[PDB]
Amino acid sequence: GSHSMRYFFTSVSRPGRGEPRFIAVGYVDDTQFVRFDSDAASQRMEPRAPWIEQEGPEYWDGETRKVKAHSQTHRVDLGTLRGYYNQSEAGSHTVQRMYGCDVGSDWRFLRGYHQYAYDGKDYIALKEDLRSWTAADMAAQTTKHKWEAAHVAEQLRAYLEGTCVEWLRRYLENGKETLQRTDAPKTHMTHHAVSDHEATLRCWALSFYPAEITLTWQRDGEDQTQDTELVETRPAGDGTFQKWAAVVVPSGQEQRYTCHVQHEGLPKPLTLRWEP
């Protein structure tokens, strides 16, 4: 299957309270492998997966230098953006940045991306061709012109199509025993009577990886979202995920309903039906 490496950065200003909070996290697919947090003790990039722990001091020293450079850029950016929008000094503002790359089943480059947000909305993004920018508004146009003059897209594309995919592949091989594995959902259904005339059916998917999953209820083979209820997919805390979907049905009609589960870990989609 395909894979990705993504880095997520958040920077938050602190009016009257000094330096901004900065948090960086790196992921291979849905598995975190590194972090940096300005509030933490080490002030270094730190490992969060077993397979990255084998990288040597040159890796850790280098990643710490680079993540601190990201932090310094964001500190400048919070001041610059406050200027561009003429915002007061009283308010906290947020910058977010995400970049990374995807590879296909042959582990060859498929796509790359870099997105930047200010106060929770798109500010500037790299286009799919990796050669030009989309600016959200007139202030972001200033940034686009600066970045064109400094040929940012060219060097960012070199990273996204080169270094990013080369290091993703290294990680996939070193972490093979856990990163190139899929955990199919463990599924089951529960039944709870509500009254003499209605009952709840709940379809559960547990212990699955990666996080992407579709749970759908059908009645007589027709998609059913009336009288349905779906929770957001949620982390178990052990590196797997959980989800459930429920429907209220007439008593005696439970067998007209089916729960349909789709997941990369399943050789075919599952259909579940309540059997008393």
Binding site: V76, T80, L81, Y116, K146, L156, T163
Partner: peptide, 9 residues
């Protein structure tokens, strides 16, 4: 591995 070249906005 991180990008080495972020540029101020």
């Amino acid at each position: 591995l991180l990008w080495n070249g972020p540029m101020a906005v």
